[PDB]
Structure formats: C-alpha cells, structure tokens
Design a protein around this nucleic acid. Structure first.
Lengths: 158, 197, 96, 69, 54
RNA sequence: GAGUACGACCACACUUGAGUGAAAACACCAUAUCCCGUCCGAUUUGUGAAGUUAAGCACUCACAGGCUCAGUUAGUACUGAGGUCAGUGAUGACUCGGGAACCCUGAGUGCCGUACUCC
RNA sequence: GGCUGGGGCGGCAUAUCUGUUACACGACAACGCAGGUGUCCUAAGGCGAGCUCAGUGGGAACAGAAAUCUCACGUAGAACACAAGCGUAAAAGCUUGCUUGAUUAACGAUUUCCAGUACGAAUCGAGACUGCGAAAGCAAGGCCAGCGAUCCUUUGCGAAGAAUAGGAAAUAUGAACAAAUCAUACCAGAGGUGUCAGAAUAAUUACCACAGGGAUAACUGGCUUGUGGCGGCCAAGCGUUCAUAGCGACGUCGCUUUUUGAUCCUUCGAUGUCGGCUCUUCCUAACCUAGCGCCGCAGAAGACGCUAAGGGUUGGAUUGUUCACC
RNA sequence: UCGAACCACCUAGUAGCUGGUUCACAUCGAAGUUUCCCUCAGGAUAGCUGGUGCUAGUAGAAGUAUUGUGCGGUAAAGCAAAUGAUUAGAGGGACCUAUUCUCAAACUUUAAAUGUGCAAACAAACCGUGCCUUAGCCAACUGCAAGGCCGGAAAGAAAAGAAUUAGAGGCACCAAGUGGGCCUUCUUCGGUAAGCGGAGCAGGCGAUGCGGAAUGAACCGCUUAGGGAUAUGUGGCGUCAAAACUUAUGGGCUCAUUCUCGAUACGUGAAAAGGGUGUUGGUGGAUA
RNA sequence: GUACUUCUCUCGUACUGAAAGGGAGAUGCAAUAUGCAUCUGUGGUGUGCACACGUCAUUUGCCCAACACC
C-alpha cells in the first residue's frame, strides 16, 4: 500500500471469486433484518455504493439502526490499549445473518425439548458413551509394518 | 524468580488509617475499628470503611434529600413497625428549598447550625455517633446514606473540552474568552456535541 | 465549462415555494471599500514609521478559482449562491 | 543523521501491559441518536405512555399496601 | 504548555523585581500598622487641639 | 406421467452432433382496419386460429468437451514449535503437530416451491 | 525552507492516488519497484426504453488487408474523460428520448487518516420542492485521487403587509433619547497559504566568529572485496605434428588487503594531514645468491617448477611529487 | 586591543547547546513508537510509569485451548486452465489442431500451516392461543416493529475426550521520565558484500548481575533480601582446575615434516572447485 | 501582636443569546398561542451499599452514592 486511500489495499479482498460473478441474488433481497440480530459484514463487490471499509470485511456484530436501504452494525475494533465499539453504516447487500449464535440456541432448544420429554418420561434416548474406554479388539486382518527395499526406489523418481 | 507478570497490577491502594488530624474522628474510628471487628454486621463495618475517607469522598447531603429519600422508604414499611434512622458519615446541611420536614432522628458527624434547628424545630432529633453505638450497636434498623458527589465543579472540569461528545467546563477565568473556534460552528468547526461509544 | 444561462432549480421563499426558472450570473464582485473596519485598522497601523506591518502574500500555488453562481429566482425575487468545482475556463453558453 | 525511523517493535507489548480492555456491553450504551427517525419517534411516543402507566402503578401500590395494613 | 492547566495570563513581563540591575515598582505594606497607630495618634492630637470643637 | 405462469439454488442445469415427443398446452404461424413503432408489421404493436412438429421447448443418446462429488497424486510439497542438530556453505534431515494443488482414475449429468391445467 | 547513506548540485520519497514490496484479517520501512494527482464534463450529470460490444468467419457493383450491406459465431478478449485495481452483458457499455437530485437538506449518526481532533473524500439517513419511469424503484454529481484554518476583504438570506404589543409569529447594536445614512454583529458561501494543520524573504566570506557534534565529511584502524592484484579447476584451440614443454578461450572456484570504492564503528574540550632523507625489523607471491625437477633442454642463453627469506638489491638527468621516463 | 578601539552601564543579555546539580532505607518502575509542528540535537499529544483513589471482592475477566460459525490468496501448486513470458518436434513457409521443454513480486483455476471476527445461560437467551401502548409496517388486526407488564422453565448448562486459571471485574483524578536505540531465531527489501542500510511477529541488552562457552552487552543456563544444607541447569571430570587418583569387565575410525592433524554451537571468529593404488566401509556388474 | 466592628466588596445560590432580551419543581385533571387544581416530595426505566421480613449465597420491599437509557 503506497497511497493509503479509502480502498487502498484490495485487488483480492474485493474481487469476486472465479465464476461466481454476478449482481446480488434475490434471496439476499428477501432476507429481512431485525435490530439486535447478529450479522456478518462481507462486502459484495457488484454493488458500488454502501460498501464497508476494508477493515470491517469479515467481521460480525449486532445490527442496531435499520434504514430503508441501509443497516448499521456494532463491531469491535481493537485500538491501542482498548476496544472501541464501532458503528458502521452499510447497504445490507454486504450483510448476511450470521450463524454464529446458532449451535448455542440449538443447545437451548434441545435442552427444553429434552426437559419436557422427561416431565412425563416417555423415557429418553440413551446416553452415548466414550470411545476412549477400554475394550478387546478382534482383528479381522493383520499386516506387518516394515521398510521395504522397494520403498526406496519409489522415493527417487523420475 | 517465580513468574508473576503482575503483580503490581492486581495490587490496589486501601489506606486503613486516617489522614485526619481531628482528635474526635480518631475516637470514632477507635469505636468502630473495635466494633466493626467483633460485631458481625454489614452496616457496622461500612461506616468504618467510610469513616476514614478524606473529606472529598464524604459529600454532604442536604436535608430534604434525607426527607425525600426516607419518605420513599416510609411508604412501604408496615405502619406498626417504624424505626428508620438516617445515618450519614458526612456533614448534613440545611435546605432552604424545602420546609415542613418530618421527624427523622438523623445521625451525622456534623450538622449545619441551620440544619439542626430545622430538624428539631420540626420534631426530630439529631444524634451523633457516640449515641448511635448505644441505639444501633448492630446497625439494626438504621438507614445509611452517602452524599451527592457528582455535581462538584471539580468533577465538571474533568475530561478534555475539545474532545467530541465531551461536555466539560474548561478552565478559564474570563468566560467570554474561549468561545470562538472549535466551539462556534461558523469558522473552523464545532466540536461534535455527541459521540457514540 | 459550458453551463446554461438559465436554470430551473427551486425557490425557497413562501412566495417562491416551487421549481422556478432562474437567471444565472457569475460572482466576481467584491470591491474593497475604505472605512470597512479592517481597512480603517490597517491604515492606523500602516501609518507612520516602521515598514510593512502586515504580512503580504507572495507564493501563489493555485491556477484556478472556485466558481460561485448567483442565481436569481424569476417569480420570487431572492438570489442564491451556488458553488461549483475548480475550472480554468468557465463560460455561460446556451444549449449545445 | 537519519531521523526518519519507523518501528512497531515494542508496541503490542505495551498495548497488552494494561491489557486490551474488552468491549463495552450491549446494554451499557445504546443512546440511539443515529437513527432511523420515524421508528425513533414512535419509540418515544410509547416510552412516554410507559411512564404514566408505571408511575400509576406506583400509586396503586401505595393504596394496596395501606389497604392491606 | 503541558497538560490541561489553565492558560496563564499573569502580567509580569515589565521590570518589577528590583534585580541587582534595576529598581522596579514594588510597593510593600510592611508599614501598614505603624501608619495605623499614626493616623490614630494624629486624630487624637487634633481632637486635643480642636477642643471643644467636634 | 406431463405442460404452462411465477420462481429459489444458479452448468449434475451449459456446449456440440444425432434420436424420439400421447393428450393438453407452448410455439411456429396467417394477417396489418384500429392503438402503436420502424427503411422494412423483421423486432415490435393490434386484430385471429387457416396450417406444422420442421424449428424452439421437453426427453433420450455419445468409451463426446465442460461441469459436480469422491478417489489417487500423498502424509510427497509446504508449515507452527525444538536443538551447544548435520554441513565450509548451499541447504537438509530429525523430533511434538497440522497438511495441500493440477494432471490421472472411477462415478454422476439438475434439483426444490406456489398456482392453474392435460391423462 | 526541509528531507538527504556528510553537506552541496539533482530529486520530491513535503499534501497526495492504484498495483507491488507486505509475510492469506488489519497494520508495516527505505532517495524500494511500476505508474498517477492540482484538472476535465449542461453532458461525460439524472432517469426510462431499445440494443450488444473487441474480434472472427461465409457472401455482396467498383471495393483491394482495409468503405458499406447481410448472416453466423462471439464470457467481455471492448467500453466506462484520465494512472491502476476492482466491478458490470435484456448493463454500470452503446443509441435514443425527456430532463436539472450538480439545488435546498431542521447543527442527525458513522466510516477513512486518527489523538479516535480538524481537513479532504465517502456511507447510512429525516424534511422540502422535484426529475425520468406504466410501475416497483433510481438520483443530492461523474463510486473510490482531483484539495484549504484564525484574522482580513467580499457577496447572499433577514420582500411588502399585519399585530394596542414583542407574543406562535416583526433580525439585532451604535449603550442619554429618535429618524435617514454609515459602520458592526449573527448564518451560509468566495478571495489562500502546493513547505499543502496554513512566516512576509537574495547573496558572499580565503578577514571571519560563537554554541556544540565523532548524532556527520576530509587520515589511520575495523567489517566488506564489487574494483585492483594473485592463483586454481575443466579443456575448445594455439604450439608444422601433439589439449597440458610453454600457453589456454567459453565457463568456473578461491585467495590477498600493496588499488579504488562502499559503509560511518572509534576519535571534533584536537591522534600533527604529501614526499624525500635517516634507521631498524618483519612477510614471501624468489630478482640475484645455495640445492634440485622438468622442457619444443645438443652447447650457450633461457622457459616453467620445488625446498629456501641466511645474505644482497645501486650511481644519476627531469618532476614537490608517489607514480613515470631515459 | 581593530573586517569596527577603550571604559562604565542596559546585563545575572538570550541559548532547543556543553558542563555541574550535596542524606539514607523501603515500596513500585519505564521509553526511544503513534499523530501534529520551519518539525529532524526540540516540543505538544496518545502509549509505557508512579501516586491518590472511587466502586456492591468474581461484575463488562483472558496475549490460551475445544465446539460451532464466519473472513483470507502468502508458502505450495498450475502453464496439458485465463493474462504475460517461452523451447522443440509432430499432425493437418505461414497458419490450424492436439501435445512438449521452462517461468512470474506487480499472473491465476485450486489452495495450506500459522492467524483473525463472533458465539458458548443471571440487565441475556428460550417458551406463551397472556396483556397493555403506538401519529411504525401491512390489507390487515390481534400478523409483523418497538417499550414494557404478567406468567412458564431454568442438566445455571447433561452425554459425547466436551476446558483451564497465583480470574476481584469496572471507573477516575493528578503527574514524572522517555519520544537518538541496538542485538537475535524465523519472515524480509536495496546492495557483490558489510560488524552496511530498511521493515514484520516475538525475545533480549539498554536498566542486570550470577553460573557457563579461556576472553565478549546481546549467545547458553538462570532471574538477584541476608545466611546454611541437600540437589541440579548450561558446561564439564589428564594437569592448570572442583569432578573418571587418566571410569567400564564399551564398539568403531584416525598418523597429519616449520601459520607445526584434530579437538566449545552462535563465531567466514575461516576456507572452495578439483584431486589421492593413504586407509576403512558400501552399492552394481563380471570372470573363476 | 491578640481581642472588636459593620453597610459595602467579592467568589457563590442560574443560565443562555452576537445582541436587543429572556430565564428552570412534582402529581392529577387536562389539551386552554401564560389552562386549572393540589403541595409530606425521588420525572420514569434497567443495574446498584446498608436496612427490613423471608430462604437454602439468595426472593421481594426501598433503594443512598454512582453508571446507562429516556
């Protein structure tokens, strides 16, 4: 980076992948964003206006303001001794709802559905056990490890 | 050598003793240093914590702050059982802005002359900390108060004036001196009145 | 830069309060007047002995000037001042 | 004399010496002044009516207490 | 100047300190009470001469 | 089992050369007063329905090109940590660990909704 | 003025924009690499509609490699004011139609540089009046470089009319009053600092001075060895013949510190800074002297090599010379 | 005394420059970097640091894992894939077709290791034909937005390898010194190279000795209150010199004639190409 | 020197606009270009010592200071 411009470092970060070129698909226009929701900021390059800065590409935060064509996101940018909490304004083409929170909110459902399942039983599925615990092994086939005379002429090709 | 990065950075400053030359304060801490030790009560060791704080950290509450606050608690108490004592480790002052105060049995280190009359004339008492050891040795059914520390002109000057979103009073003897750049929007710029953090 | 002699913009007054066709005239104007407060002061400082008392500017780095347009609302009477980018040659010229 | 030196050398050792303080919680500063306004207005027009209703509950719990005893 | 301190306007530039070089416009009131006892002694003596005139 | 209208993912859907297509659709088509648009009713626009599956479209096919997934390439290349390791060096092996890519082989050649309709 | 592999001269690395260095977030230096900026545009801005581009191939009076018509192919190989990158195919390109969203925008927030200050540029909004479009929608310039403090000067807004009274609504001041001028104020713009967070600026000193610097040049010494010097390896060829008696190209591997550079580690409250004379000593890559191998060594003279530094190594003309020549 | 005399005074002239700056012990303990400056031997500013603290001693904890989920174009690879270089033959002089040798910091389909953003149960999230409120959305309307209220449950986070902690979080005031750095593993640019110049991630010296490499700022071990014991690290056991009074009842290899064979990494703090029927091993082929 | 003294002076209790000028409570009713009444009172919400009544550190009450949103 010689010139320290606005979008000074990027012929790759902002390039579209090979044979993925195109303008943004419908499915990302028909997503809707509620305030408080987590989001990935990934800048699409086929929409000029509204891009996030080079730093924010690839981060996640909590949407806060929602405007007709815009959004806004709260992202943690570490600075000298501290993390400022930055508010950026993006055109939502660059925004995708994050799956980050997901496996947790699925752990919470599979607890409650578990709990209402014990309430009056029906019992419950069995608890899987460790693979690291003991056992006798009954080998179906057994072979020998050795270094072969032939193994060396394979490592000098040609 | 054992590895303890720091170790100078978990350590904090406490200062058990007092910085006051007052011979009477040195008696009051003598009482609570004793009876915050052996008493097994929360109240009674907070006032020992508070009794060594230098004047800046003990801010006077006005009267009418005790009254308003204690009228908020007196509503939800049982009508049979009432014995709250206003216990303040600072100075208690006289509020000209309020008249007709009930009778509160306030306790304090020092009373404004107009504040003490303005209590007893309305029927309450004023009882200092050598009494309250006799009335509330456990601190039982006391009501402990602090002050108001955030309106001081020193707390108002803190922070830089020209930082965006900082409303702070700069140091100048002539107030008409610094209005004219970075304050007014017209010339060079105006410091932003509000900034998200 | 060719720019129209007449431009339909907007007029701000309650009397204007719509798009009105204006009349475009360039701002190259001010004539320094004596008895302006800063000139009355520079004559009391400059007077007498001592040299030039106020810094005179020599090093001139710019070849252009921003172009201010005085636009006079036709049906409503106010003038507006609109600023444009820097250009070395500015000309008001009908449609091309 | 060549005075133009630039280094990052000791810095991230200093930046972590008081540590990098983690972010401020979501609940702490909201202060929505950004903001999309016609939603912001309709938020205060409710946030007033929640004050009346909540300050009324302050009165109904004054009576209901003294009512109890 | 360093820090948040106020912008000092103290006007001491003119020569005031009586530096071994110069003299310097310093007025000192160390004689205040001796002139307090003198203005009184001279109100009494005039009262003693003016007598019995108010 | 299909068609049409709207579609989601956007080649397992494309590209080329062949083959076959029930009904209903789709379309090609006939035409140019009127609305409309051009050098040209070609595109287009308006009227309608005599003709054909020839073409589009749907389907099947090809030791087809491409593309999808998995193998192999290969625990090789590279690489985080280590040495009072080897070597004059260039570099390399070793130790605790992560671990590729093309060619090459085999297998696949769209799928999923709403609405109306055909046997 | 400044930066500066001493200073000067040159340059601009001084404000700046794209690719790379840059090490798969971001950040990252050099007088590192390859280029840009101070402008240009009432259309090259805004929008709707129709179309498809560079090129290739078949065919058509003159007409050809190259004119215009026609068909087919055509993933962008074209274009988008310009440097570069990125992005775009019923468009962001081209043609065409209507237009002024290149205006105003209540002191909204935010990004970039960053101290999380300003400037520049940019993103997201809310209000006014609009433009194009059947409509959804699009537009506050041409995405992203194309720019400017305090003070001073200068222009624009505060039309008329009404108020029994300064209010919801009439711009304020000239301070004893009141008018009409004049001046000033509050708001938004322009005139500019290119050293670009913004001084008003030509030389010489060998007659020179001061404060300091080994933070920094002119000696030695140190590192390095390109350059100079010296040597080896391979063997195309020369030597009538025959690679190697003696040489040895194209290549290639080293050594030395008697050359010149490169650097700037030591010395600036001081290491006396060319050459000769004098005097001693050391090194060997050996000129003579001792012993020897080998030859394109018949003898004579000599070539090449080995051990070996014990001994020796001159008299002069010219030049301040070292060097050089007789 | 002269490229501006002498005397006294303004005058203790100004200096970002050189020199100096007098008692002890204790608790702590840096920086040579950022941004701006006619700025580059200096300052202001953030950072590092100390003092005073405030605040309800596990809160808004983390220079680290695991799980889930995002981001990426360096090393590698590729030219039989685009862009740019590029050798040769063949097939149907140039061409055309399919291959071929060789490449790229400013090329790329593909694409690591190390990294980086977030999340992982107490102001939160999850659940409800709950209710209230709106000048928000809509052709709906008890749907969706928001602030609440009231109920529900809460392994307080199971099982699956399924975390750990010398984890009191958080806020504030005042202020010093520093803003010439230098060295090293690895990455790394200019240079033939440099004990040269310039950076990245870190660790050190600076400021710090002590044990060790004979010696050395930085290497190796180690981290220092005043003492004793036992044990060790790096490095060592022929004498110097503590330890094999020259250990083994261990295996090989090596003879080096004047800078004298070799023998402490970092330390080219010294050696290469090329040679040797010196000696000691091995691989392949061959005659008996 | 100590002892004594006042009207005043001055820093404060209020700020804002260039200025002429203006100038701050709560609740209820209520919408009146100065609405009306009451006056023992935190403007509201989330977090938050001590205290109080419970419970197996913690439920609720009030929450002082203080932080944040209005």
């Amino acid at each position: 980076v010689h010139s320290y411009g606005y979008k000074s470092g990027t012929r790759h970060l902002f390039a579209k992948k090979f044979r993925k070129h195109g303008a943004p698909s419908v499915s990302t226009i028909l997503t809707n964003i509620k305030v408080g929701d987590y989001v990935d900021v990934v800048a699409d390059s086929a929409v000029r206006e509204g891009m996030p800065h080079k730093y924010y590409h690839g981060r996640t935060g909590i949407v806060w303001n929602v405007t007709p064509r815009g959004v806004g996101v709260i992202i943690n940018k570490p600075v000298r001794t501290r993390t400022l909490r930055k508010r950026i304004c993006v055109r939502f083409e660059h925004v995708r709802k994050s799956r980050c929170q997901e496996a947790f909110k699925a752990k919470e459902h599979q607890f409650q559905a578990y709990l209402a399942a014990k309430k009056a039983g029906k019992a419950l599925p069995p608890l899987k056990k460790s693979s690291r615990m003991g056992g006798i092994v009954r080998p179906k086939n057994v072979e020998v490890l050795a270094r072969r005379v032939a193994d060396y002429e394979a490592m000098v090709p040609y | 050598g054992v590895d303890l990065t720091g170790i100078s950075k978990k350590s904090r400053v406490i200062r058990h003793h007092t910085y006051s030359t007052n011979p009477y304060i040195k008696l009051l801490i003598k009482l609570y240093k004793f009876l915050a030790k052996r008493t097994s009560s929360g109240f009674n060791k907070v006032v020992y914590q508070r009794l060594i704080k230098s004047r800046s950290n003990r801010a006077p509450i006005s009267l009418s702050r005790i009254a308003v606050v204690m009228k908020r608690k007196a509503v939800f108490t049982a009508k049979s059982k009432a014995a709250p004592i206003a216990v303040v480790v600072g100075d208690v002052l006289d509020d000209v802005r309020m008249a007709r105060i009930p009778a509160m049995r306030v306790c304090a280190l020092r009373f404004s002359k107009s504040a003490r009359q303005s209590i007893v004339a309305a029927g309450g008492e004023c009882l200092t900390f050598d009494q309250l050891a006799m009335i509330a040795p456990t601190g039982k059914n006391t009501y402990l108060l602090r002050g108001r520390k955030s309106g001081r002109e020193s707390v108002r000057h803190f922070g830089a004036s020209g930082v965006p979103g900082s409303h702070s009073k700069p140091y100048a003897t002539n107030r008409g001196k610094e209005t004219k750049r970075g304050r007014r929007t017209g010339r060079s710029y105006k410091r932003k009145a509000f900034r998200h953090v | 830069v060719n720019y129209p002699k007449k431009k339909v913009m907007h007029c701000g007054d309650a009397r204007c309060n719509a798009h009105k066709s204006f009349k475009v005239v360039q701002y190259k104007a001010g004539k320094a007047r004596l008895f302006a407060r800063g000139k009355r002061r520079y004559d009391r400082k400059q007077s007498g002995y001592g040299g030039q008392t106020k810094p005179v500017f020599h090093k001139k780095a710019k070849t252009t000037k921003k172009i201010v347009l005085k636009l006079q609302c036709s049906g409503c009477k106010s003038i507006r001042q609109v600023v444009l980018k820097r250009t070395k040659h500015f000309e008001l010229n009908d449609k091309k | 004399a060549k005075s133009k030196n630039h280094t990052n050398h000791n810095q991230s050792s200093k930046n972590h010496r008081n540590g990098i303080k983690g972010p401020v919680p979501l609940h702490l500063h909201n202060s929505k002044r950004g903001s999309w306004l016609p939603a912001l207005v309709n938020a205060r027009r409710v946030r007033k009516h929640n004050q009346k209703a909540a300050l009324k509950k302050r009165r109904e719990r004054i009576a209901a207490f003294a009512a109890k005893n | 100047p360093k820090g948040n301190n106020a912008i000092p306007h103290v006007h001491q530039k003119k020569h005031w300190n009586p530096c071994s070089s110069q003299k310097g416009n310093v007025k000192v009131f160390l004689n205040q009470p001796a002139q307090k006892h003198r203005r009184r002694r001279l109100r009494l003596l005039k009262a003693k001469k003016v007598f019995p005139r108010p």
